[PDB]
Paper text:
p97, also known as valosin-containing protein, is an essential cytosolic AAA+ (ATPases associated with diverse cellular activities) hexamer that unfolds substrate polypeptides to support protein homeostasis and macromolecular disassembly. p97 forms homohexamers that enclose a central channel through which substrates are translocated and unfolded; each protomer consists of two AAA+ ATPase domains (D1 and D2), an N-terminal domain (NTD) and an unstructured C-terminal tail. UBXD1 contains three conserved p97 interaction motifs: a VCP-interacting motif (VIM) helix and ubiquitin regulatory X (UBX) domain, which canonically interact with the NTD, and a PUB domain (peptide:N-glycanase and UBA-containing or UBX-containing proteins) that interacts with the C-terminal tail.
A prevalent class, termed p97–UBXD1VIM, closely resembles the previously determined structure of the p97 hexamer bound to ADP (p97ADP, Cα root mean square deviation (r.m.s.d.) of 1.0 Å)36 but features additional helical density in the NTD cleft of all protomers that corresponds to the UBXD1 VIM. Cryo-EM analysis of p97–UBXD1 incubated with ATPγS revealed three predominant classes: a UBXD1-bound hexamer similar to the ADP-bound closed state, a symmetric hexamer lacking UBXD1 density with NTDs in the ‘up’, ATP conformation and a symmetric hexamer similar to p97–UBXD1VIM. Despite the unambiguous presence of ATPγS in all nucleotide-binding pockets, the NTDs adopt the ‘down’ conformation in maps containing UBXD1 density (the closed and VIM-only states), indicating that UBXD1 interactions favor the NTD ‘down’ state and appear to override the ‘up’ conformation observed in ATP-bound structures. We postulate that the symmetric VIM-only class in the ADP and ATPγS datasets may be a consequence of our incubation conditions involving a high, 2:1 concentration of UBXD1 relative to the p97 monomer.
Numbering used by the authors:
A (entry chain J): 49 to 68
B (entry chain D): 23 to 707, 728 to 763
C (entry chain E): 270 to 707, 728 to 763
Amino acid sequence: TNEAQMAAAAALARLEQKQS
Amino acid sequence: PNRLIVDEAINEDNSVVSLSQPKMDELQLFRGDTVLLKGKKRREAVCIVLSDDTCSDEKIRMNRVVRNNLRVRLGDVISIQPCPDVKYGKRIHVLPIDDTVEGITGNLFEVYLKPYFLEAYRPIRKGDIFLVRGGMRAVEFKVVETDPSPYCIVAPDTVIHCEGEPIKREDEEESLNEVGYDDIGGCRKQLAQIKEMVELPLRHPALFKAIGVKPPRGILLYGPPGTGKTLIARAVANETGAFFFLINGPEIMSKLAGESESNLRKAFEEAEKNAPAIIFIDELDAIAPKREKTHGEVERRIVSQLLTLMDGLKQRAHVIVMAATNRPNSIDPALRRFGRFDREVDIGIPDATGRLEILQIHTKNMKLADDVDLEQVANETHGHVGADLAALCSEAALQAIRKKMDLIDLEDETIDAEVMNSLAVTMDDFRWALSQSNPSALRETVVEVPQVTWEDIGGLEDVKRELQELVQYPVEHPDKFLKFGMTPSKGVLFYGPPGCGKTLLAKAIANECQANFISIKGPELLTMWFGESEANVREIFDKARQAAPCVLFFDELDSIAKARGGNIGDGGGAADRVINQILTEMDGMSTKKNVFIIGATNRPDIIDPAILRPGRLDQLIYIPLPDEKSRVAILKANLRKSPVAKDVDLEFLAKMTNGFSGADLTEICQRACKLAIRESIESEIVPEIRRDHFEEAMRFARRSVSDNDIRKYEMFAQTLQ
Amino acid sequence: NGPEIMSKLAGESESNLRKAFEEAEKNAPAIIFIDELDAIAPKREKTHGEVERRIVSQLLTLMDGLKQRAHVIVMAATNRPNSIDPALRRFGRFDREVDIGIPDATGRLEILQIHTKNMKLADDVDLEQVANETHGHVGADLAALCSEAALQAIRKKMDLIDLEDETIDAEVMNSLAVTMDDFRWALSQSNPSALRETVVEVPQVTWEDIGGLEDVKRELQELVQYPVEHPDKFLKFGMTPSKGVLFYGPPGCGKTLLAKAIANECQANFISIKGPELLTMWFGESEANVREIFDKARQAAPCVLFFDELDSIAKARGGNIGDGGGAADRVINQILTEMDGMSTKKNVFIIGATNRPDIIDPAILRPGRLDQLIYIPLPDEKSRVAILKANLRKSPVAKDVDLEFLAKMTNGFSGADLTEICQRACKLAIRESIESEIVPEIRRDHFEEAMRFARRSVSDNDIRKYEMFAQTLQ
Ligand SMILES: Nc1ncnc2c1ncn2[C@@H]1O[C@H](COP(=O)(O)OP(=O)(O)O)[C@@H](O)[C@H]1O
Ligand SMILES: Nc1ncnc2c1ncn2[C@@H]1O[C@H](COP(=O)(O)OP(=O)(O)O)[C@@H](O)[C@H]1O
Ligand SMILES: Nc1ncnc2c1ncn2[C@@H]1O[C@H](COP(=O)(O)OP(=O)(O)O)[C@@H](O)[C@H]1O
């Protein structure tokens, strides 16, 4: 649902900050 | 169904679990969807699933926080299912653990929970444990009460509460600040090797006692002090759950006769009662040194007592004894015989990548300023081990603390969390700490995969290909060598003028092959010759075996022949003490150890011909002075990192420097850089290296290899036909 | 065992050792096995403690008590016969010795077969190939090798079936096959405990592997076999059998193979002493180690003790010009001494080889030493063909390869030089084969290209040097 999609954007952004 | 093996995670984020794309389609979930994980004792955790290019298809990668919430350990199997109906919450009540908040006071929400939860959209379940780092402390929290149940996602408008006494830790719940695998930086290859040896008999004891195959009983870890020998032993016990019993030399040797032997025996009895168990014996050389080095009754008895206790491990099922020493040959050789301590792992010294990982680990709780560059530090910390990098981070932290504490002047029994949380450690504090730190492994042998790649070597296109045939093919295509009855070469000798890239060639092939590079330089061969200590060659070749796969490079192979007079020489022949030991070790080395020997000489006419016979350095490659197209490539490689102005014509320089070696072109590059630096410094009392700087450099740079020496190499190459 | 006795206190170690002998007598016939004997009764010169001195004396008296303790035999294990109190080895006590040594390629295969009896092996597993690769291993290492290969196979299946219970399913293990990849992995992890030990074994080189030299093959049989196959004729005619022969001639002509092939046909242990070992003793002033080499030859008898590069020291001393001294040196003098003290009744035959006979200490050529000298010339045309066929015996050579024409071209080549051609052509075939996957045989083109680089290593100036020496000897 939409709360999972908002968590998806936040989790993906933190992953990119750690990988970069 | 949907049962996957629990693996280690790369992403430290407590709300993120990694699954390989094919499992996202089997589970019919989208990237970033929220899933539940089913653990043990009717427990579960909620997390967000992301994809990467490293997770194994059949594994789920989760960190320590998630595994503890599920009460599972690495190697177990858990179930994963989507839960697309997860909703947001309005109220979450979080309290700290009593065993982690001590000596520190302040507004826990503003410091820890607010940046953790705010706009993070984390899934939370009732009873979850999670860790928030900051202010140079690692503070773990438990979630006790929420409005929705059993789980929800925190929204930007969710209110976080924290009232009540700290929570007493449960006896079956391990602290997140205990030593685990994520506390170990470099030496990942050794940790993986050890895990394979120990995790199987410790996690699945029913396997070994039910089959005719016996487990490893004793593992000896060796390397310089401060490299993580104890850190690994603790991480293994804490991750598998085996009972950990600590032994150390000083504790046993400080006891009187009749007490030291008794206490050592008790340690083995306690491990058996608590089996599966690991007995870690640190400073083993202090308990059971080589017999030839001791004559006391107490030292002789404790050697015999340890040997009998190690042999008793045939009955003490599921007990593994690990030991730490500085050198595998400092202890009674009996310990290393079949059984007892018959497995060995060389921990070594972290390389530039491992040192960066260690610095990142020991700064997890530290707030770093934007100017801090830990990769730059890792490159400067040559000769340091993990213990020194930990001290380096501590000293940098204390320098930052002093600067602020002397200004705020707040003296009390506890520290304000906000004061530490807003304290940033700058690059100046790390640079200061680097000046104060003193590496403990400065004179130790450096064994690492070289950072030199083929792009760093100009010209020599045919030599690059030849090395790939000599080094990679024998192990990438072994069935063709067997098919045709070919005996792979054990090594190659490079000869030619100095400064033409002979060293880079050996490093670059070691890099592409991801093999450890061991550099032996002229002064080391001369030291062994002059000091009549050629026996040390055996330790060099044995280190190559220990570090395999590796490339063992002997530079300045003629250094001794020249020290003996070179062009005229002395009363003897070509053979000498050190080269003879090198010949002996090569003859006893098999190609199955994946150790490739490379030599280099600037005077092939005085190399003991024995080294060129079949079975030794039978291949010979000539490295000439670079031609015009190569000299341009060399200039570009040497200037790859320099701010060269667009007006610099590197092709014109290559045309002028007709007789120059690669090293001579480097002098031009560095001399021009020096001139640019001088002008830049003067302008403050410039943004790029200008044509004028290279033109002035050409006024001093000269070829180091004369035509008389070029013919010497050509005549040798002609002799080889 | 040493650790069990030495871990005890003064008054307990001696008592427990005495009890062991009393128990064996009560249960006679009995065998007392003392492992790590060097830990109980080391050479006296190496210890001064009262406990170590007493336990040496106590063991000596208990061994002497075996005159009354009927039917009790005491066996002991040590690493070296000279690491223990020499008194133990005097008449009586421990007056019999057996040298166990290190298993050879055949023995290693047998050990691998023994420690896999319970293992299910896949069709791709080749234990003979493993036995040939496990150089320097002892039985303890091959046992660990099989264990590691088993565990790698087990992990691969156990992580997939996920069956966790108190007992193991017999069907699961019974259907688990250990593949060659698991043995190869285990070989990479295994680390031999005897890597630097002296290798003493019957060589796999046979006469079929040596091209040419038909007359030398016959001569060596007369020198090595006749003194033991027909000893009654040597006594009848008052003949003193030769104790050894020196090979001389150009390098790479088969001098080493000749020594191995005769050792093989005679089923005798071959002991190889290479140039670097003679130089190591000279450089380090440790020529005393020659006594242990000749003593090993006695222990391993019947055997052939081969001293390669006998001139290695003479060359290290300047060779063509030399230094201020004469032909004699530290290492050769110890070799001369040991040969003089060696009897032909031990069935130990000494063979030397040199590439520079003009600088060999003439003492080694006197009666009683290496009095026989055999010249090994460069191979002639018919021999070079035989050499090519021998070197290519295991290679997939195409039918279009004309080895007789190749032998005609390589007129001045040594046997080692013909091998370089064979291996260089193989390398070219391998390179092409690997490229075809990114070929089934070695084609004429590969040998023709090899001839572009292969050269004779022995010049005419060096051939005459050997001819002049051979002419002097008639
Ligand atoms: N590879 C490593 N990764 C992370 N920390 C390390 C590593 N090696 C050493 N350290 C750190 O250095 C110290 C090593 O001390 P310890 O494990 O007790 O070693 P020793 O056995 O020499 O006493 C610890 O603080 C540990 O965290
Ligand atoms: N082919 C080349 N490409 C790039 N740089 C080179 C080349 N040859 C020499 N150099 C420069 O010369 C320096 C010395 O090279 P090196 O191989 O270490 O010399 P040697 O092998 O004689 O010790 C290197 O630092 C490198 O920058
Ligand atoms: N007569 C021969 N028959 C077959 N191969 C030979 C012969 N002579 C030399 N070779 C080849 O040359 C190589 C070196 O021979 P070897 O006897 O070891 O030389 P050396 O005795 O000078 O050390 C051997 O591997 C062998 O393949």
